[PDB]
Design a protein around this ligand. Sequence first.
Ligand SMILES: *[C@@H]1O[C@H](CO)[C@@H](O)[C@H](O)[C@H]1NC(C)=O
Ligand SMILES: *[C@@H]1O[C@H](CO)[C@@H](O)[C@H](O)[C@H]1NC(C)=O
Ligand SMILES: *[C@@H]1O[C@H](CO)[C@@H](O)[C@H](O)[C@H]1NC(C)=O
Lengths: 373, 373, 373, 82, 82, 82
Amino acid sequence: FLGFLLGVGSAIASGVAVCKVLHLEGEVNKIKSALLSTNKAVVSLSNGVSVLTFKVLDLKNYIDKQLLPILNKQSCSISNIETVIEFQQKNNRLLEITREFSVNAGVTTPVSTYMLTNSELLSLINDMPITNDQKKLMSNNVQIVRQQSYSIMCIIKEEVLAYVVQLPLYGVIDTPCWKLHTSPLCTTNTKEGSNICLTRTDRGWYCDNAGSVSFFPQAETCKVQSNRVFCDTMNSLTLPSEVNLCNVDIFNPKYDCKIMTSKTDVSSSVITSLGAIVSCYGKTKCTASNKNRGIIKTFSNGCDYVSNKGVDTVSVGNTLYYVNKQEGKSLYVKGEPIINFYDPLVFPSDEFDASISQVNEKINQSLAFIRKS
Amino acid sequence: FLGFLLGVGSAIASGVAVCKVLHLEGEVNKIKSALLSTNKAVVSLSNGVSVLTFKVLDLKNYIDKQLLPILNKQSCSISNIETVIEFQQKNNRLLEITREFSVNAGVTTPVSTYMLTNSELLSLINDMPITNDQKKLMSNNVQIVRQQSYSIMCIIKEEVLAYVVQLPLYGVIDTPCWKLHTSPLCTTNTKEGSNICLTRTDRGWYCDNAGSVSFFPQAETCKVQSNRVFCDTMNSLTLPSEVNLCNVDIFNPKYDCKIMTSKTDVSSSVITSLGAIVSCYGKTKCTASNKNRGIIKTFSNGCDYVSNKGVDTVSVGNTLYYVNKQEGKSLYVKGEPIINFYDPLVFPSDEFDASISQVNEKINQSLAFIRKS
Amino acid sequence: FLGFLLGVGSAIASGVAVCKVLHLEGEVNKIKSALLSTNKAVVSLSNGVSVLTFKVLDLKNYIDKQLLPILNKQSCSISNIETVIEFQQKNNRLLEITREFSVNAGVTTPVSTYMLTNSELLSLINDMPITNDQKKLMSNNVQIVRQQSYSIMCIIKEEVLAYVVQLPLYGVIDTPCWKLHTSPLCTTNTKEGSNICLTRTDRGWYCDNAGSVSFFPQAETCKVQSNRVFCDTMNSLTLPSEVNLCNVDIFNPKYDCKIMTSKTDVSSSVITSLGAIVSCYGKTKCTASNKNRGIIKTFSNGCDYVSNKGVDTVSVGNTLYYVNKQEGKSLYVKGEPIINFYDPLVFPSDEFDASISQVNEKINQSLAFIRKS
Amino acid sequence: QNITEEFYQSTCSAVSKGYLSALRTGWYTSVITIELSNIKENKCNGTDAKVKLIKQELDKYKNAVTELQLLMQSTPATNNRA
Amino acid sequence: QNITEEFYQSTCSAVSKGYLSALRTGWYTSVITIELSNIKENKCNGTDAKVKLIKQELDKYKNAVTELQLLMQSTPATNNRA
Amino acid sequence: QNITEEFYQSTCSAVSKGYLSALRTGWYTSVITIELSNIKENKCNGTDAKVKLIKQELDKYKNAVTELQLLMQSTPATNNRA
Ligand SMILES: *[C@@H]1O[C@H](CO)[C@@H](O)[C@H](O)[C@H]1NC(C)=O
Ligand SMILES: *[C@@H]1O[C@H](CO)[C@@H](O)[C@H](O)[C@H]1NC(C)=O
Ligand SMILES: *[C@@H]1O[C@H](CO)[C@@H](O)[C@H](O)[C@H]1NC(C)=O
């Protein structure tokens, strides 16, 4: 929800600065030299950036040493298909890299196999100035490293093609993360509408990071494997650790908990890691079923939860949800719905991006006029 | 607009559960056996899911029976290019499936041709436990079936590669659908600003489904052919059939019609199925033209409509819109703009996600203080 | 921010109308004839649209004149691989175009190389009825022309495959553009919360166009090269030129400046073209550093700016931003923060999509009750 | 001058100036064609490996046409409403 | 009738009628398999160009398997929460 | 323990606990190169089919370079502002 609150930055800005340097004055020859003896070499830029350079595919030594005698004539008398196939094969990668840059106006993401192969990528990781453990992490999650990487087209100066592959660095590893799932909380009165709602807006991923908590408002941006949560700090907000108070106590003074108000009595379900939150309102059919046994729980009006244990499916109206079948324990923490603490009249029904105290100020303000007048 | 109101679920959760089963204990051999006699076979999982299995591409019997005699030496004396080309061709699909999974971290959508070809897909449809009519529908809309499908990478256990293709089931067919297009309704006073607006927020696709109406708030999510509307019920809200009252009567007691308020006197056009809605305000040039004849209608300030009949284009300020050229009749239903019923002072100008009664409560509340004080 | 304010239209509606004409009655033969003598020809449709037609790839004259003698037997006695390779090569494009349409349900964007190659595209541009200068622009920005183009599958009538490539026309060129970056403005009181915020909502691209200003609310939609800004007028709003008053004077009577209010005291940075805006609030670490030298500026609570000159990085909490290294001068325009002009009580804290006067009306309204009661 | 920027302290906003427009106004509709052939399943014993590759690629071409033919009906989308 | 439209002047809204549904309700899970081989790095001098192309494509197949094998562990994503 | 969940009845929210971070903080810029050749349109009669395929693929390589050369100027995008 809170996605609009995020700042802005250019992801490719570091890789772009490497292109600026690769142009002047010239530096292309500096790396062409370094890549004559080996297919891979570390190079220090005049800028002073120590950059790992790779000679993936050498078309020069193939066209010059295998195709050039045939065309520097005369008459192309000698030829063989075992060379036409070998050339078609060799050339393809350049053709496929060229295809990719032509649609993505010289900046691709994820970094494709043609841009950098698995063996090339795993070698690049293993030759990076990173921790022994950090190398293992990246190698075991290449699929993610590719999705979090960028490929920037740079230049074709003198006899050379250069494109910058910009790979992630994980400065925060093995710190505790948690996912907060929120759904609307509404009064369950027997009337047409005339119901008041409240929804926690703070839904998203949360990670302890440098004494604060990194908040990912659009949980849709993070990639998750098993325990492992892969995020980009650019898609975060850095909040005080007291943000976690809103879970146990939303009325705490230490942190003003982000909520939104409505009269939108709409039914829905949120599928969590280990269960399902059901926001059931009106004349809606809200159910949790097991494949073989059928309906195992019928949800009453209000907000409830069901654990994945022995539940495969949750149905809210005409919508069917498959619950995640992950092994883990869940805890129901019984409590009086926060919405019951509010007088319907004098309660501010249209706060789009509010908080507990904002709502409480508005309640007093409105209340005072009725009493003072 | 109302997209934020939707619930959450995992689309691949069913296909993921098939991967869990395909791993244990082992079940890979159970299907390897079943796919020795035929290239396609129905298999019942220990789970008891009856799953259609397909042996698309058999690289074993090609490498073992055509390439193995050459390399189980010695000396690779015998060789022929008619075999190098045949192998390059055969291998490519595995290479192209591997490419796809490497960027999409093992989950692709739409399901590509390399993942499942048209002949394979049309055969899969024709061997599904679905209605005679339902088979025709899917076969005639393969392009859609592909966009609504998922391909999940599973495992490579013993000599086998398995990936799950998860295809849609259309439990609701041939039920009436309708698309609601909304635009802002504003007062047209000759002043700088000081105008009040209202916009129906309920824009989207609507389908009668099981006694209720399935509402698709982001009409951008549905795929449409001709008459046919293809939707995913996960992108819906299930509303009472009385939601259709807001069209004919927005003031009806039976349903509280979702509206939003502003003082945002901004010009725009919405291109409908058979015409164009024009919200013309301020000093804006709002026009409807025919290619050959030029300007055929000049819109006055306020919200109006023009039918596609003899209209190719609609221009609102510096923006040109091409109207849809579909054959169909449209009906102008004359009525006093709902915004004229509101006293500008005492009218709540910033309701982001409201409804008629919410607005009416706020109007009374504010009105009472002026009268009672 | 203001993206929801945009109108709606169908981009492919013009190209779709060409498909309707290409079907009847028949018109396919009219173009088959015209494309017998040349591989490229201008054709006037019965509709009267003068459309450039291209015969890219002629599979008929290859299968009929090079493969047909072999299969119109008998016995396929004569054959050669130099023909199997030539055919595989020739056929591939049709196969790759077919792949593309199968996933994109017959409508692709960007227009791929297989759909239209660079040499084909550059020739198409050079044969269009456009200005000498307009030809240069498009040819120098093909990567953009591709991203702004659509490829619509049409028909395979009699011996022919036709797909419409719909290319942009730039009716507005070399007019001044500017980008407005906004960040939240908040009070910096030493209390837990109890702070009031304000944010300019008008962020986006702005271009002078036909006496008005074309506003692109989602600056994320525009493609930029160097000076050059490429936009689609469909993603714009057409505003009076007085919108630029909000920059120099947000309190001006001529235009009601779009702002939003909150109590959301959240830290962030916005990376601009030539610097960085820092919105620093609470206990957040807000800094600007140089690679070699480290921290060069520590931001105090409130909204500030730092120019890219000698700054490579900006850090707001746990988030690092790379500043753009573009050469250009920036100007700090000192001024009293607009939020200091507001009494915290009686200030409307939750205006999601407001403006200066809306806020000012609300302030008076609330103020009057306290005074009159 | 060229690219220049002004930061407004009072509003917490900055304007980047010095850009030139290239705004899409119209459209140019071009008809791209591929001239194909209408051979029919020819039948031959030809067990030759060079022929079977030609038979393999010819099936690929034939299926592509059938695919594209099925791809037509109905008319395009285009997922509107935003 | 078929496609018809009604414009409501009072609400600034229009309803397009005459459509038929095809709403995704369930799912059909199919297991697609590729039967592969388990050869081991065979060693031969074979300097022949026809062989080295076969050696080149065989390495491509072997690497693809290794890639797909590494692609497994852990289980899929799928970037939820909207 | 590992993955655990707590549902808060009073707030209609649930927290999934037991995860470990891998947050992208920095960037590693690597320069990937392709060493190419600078042949010039060689002219030969060579009507040989094996040669014309080599001539066909050589044109593909030459055009790719020209494409990539045209692809440079100006510098990258990247569609910012969110
Ligand atoms: C309003 O709530 C505050 C707590 O924030 C309380 O101190 C005050 O007494 C309430 N209104 C009054 C003073 O009547
Ligand atoms: C406010 O509107 C309601 C209708 O919902 C009406 O019953 C009431 O009379 C109005 N305010 C009053 C009571 O003055
Ligand atoms: C409210 O502000 C307006 C300016 O728009 C001013 O004319 C008026 O005097 C203020 N309230 C009053 C009248 O006390």
